[PDB]
Amino acid sequence: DRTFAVKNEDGKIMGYAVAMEGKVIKPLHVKGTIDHPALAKLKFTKSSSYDMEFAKLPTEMKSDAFGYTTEHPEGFYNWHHGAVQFSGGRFTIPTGAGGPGDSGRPILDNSGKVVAIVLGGANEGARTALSVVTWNKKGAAIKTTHEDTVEW
């Protein structure tokens, strides 16, 4: 288990955190507490520019974390709600497959490596373009935001 619900005070799921490469990572805009004893009270470092916040992964969860890959060839990827196309530098889904509460969910390749973290979606009709965080080969974060993105 490397994906954790972020809960508001009522216990409603607001979005998700992931364990990846020695960090716990979540979208900054997802407000609540991670529903995990080892993770609730960690010290987070916030980056407004990338809509992300991160903490050091507790040494108990060392090995139970996703790997990340910069290999994103065009084609199809996976996430909790089904297929994610990557084409023309954009990740898209059928409109209606994602919405509020899906921020922080990872997009995975078939080997189970993370290629992106979902921030939200811009409704283009049949397709919805996902606003995401990715990392390049230098480990630099990249936020991709589409016109009229809806935060999830």
Numbering used by the authors: 116 to 267
Relevant lines from the article:
The nucleocapsid core is formed by the encapsidation of RNA by CP which consists of two domains: the amino-terminal domain that is involved in RNA binding and the carboxyl-terminal domain that possesses protease activity. The E2 glycoprotein interacts with the nucleocapsid complex via a hydrophobic pocket present in the carboxyl-terminal region of the CP that leads to budding of alphaviruses. Alphavirus CP possesses cis-autoproteolytic activity for its cleavage from the rest of the structural polyprotein during the viral infection process. Here, we report the high-resolution crystal structures of the post-cleavage state of the AVCP and dioxane-bound AVCP at 1.81 Å and 1.98 Å resolution respectively.
Considering these facts, we expressed, purified and crystallized the C-terminal domain (residues 110–267) of AVCP for our studies. The structure of AVCP was refined to 1.81 Å resolution with Rcryst value of 17.6% and Rfree value of 23.1%. 152 out of 158 residues have well defined electron density while electron density was missing at the N-terminus for the first six residues (110–115) in AVCP. The overall fold of AVCP (C-terminal domain) consists of two β-barrel sub-domains similar to crystal structures of other alphavirus CPs. The sub-domains I and II consist of six and eight β-strands respectively, joined via a long linker loop region comprising of eighteen residues (Leu172-Glu189). As a conserved feature of all the members of serine protease family, AVCP contains a catalytic triad formed of His144, Ser218 and Asp166 residues. Once cleaved, the mature CP does not cleave other CPs further in trans due to the binding of the C-terminal Trp267 residue at the P1 position near the active site. AVCP appears to be monomeric both in the crystal structure as well as in solution as observed by size-exclusion chromatography. Particularly, AVCP does not possess any helix in the structure, whereas CPs of other alphaviruses possess a 310 and/or an α-helix. The apo form of AVCP crystal structure reveals the presence of hydrophobic pocket composed of conserved residues on the surface of CP, which has also been reported in both the crystal structures of SCP and SFCP.
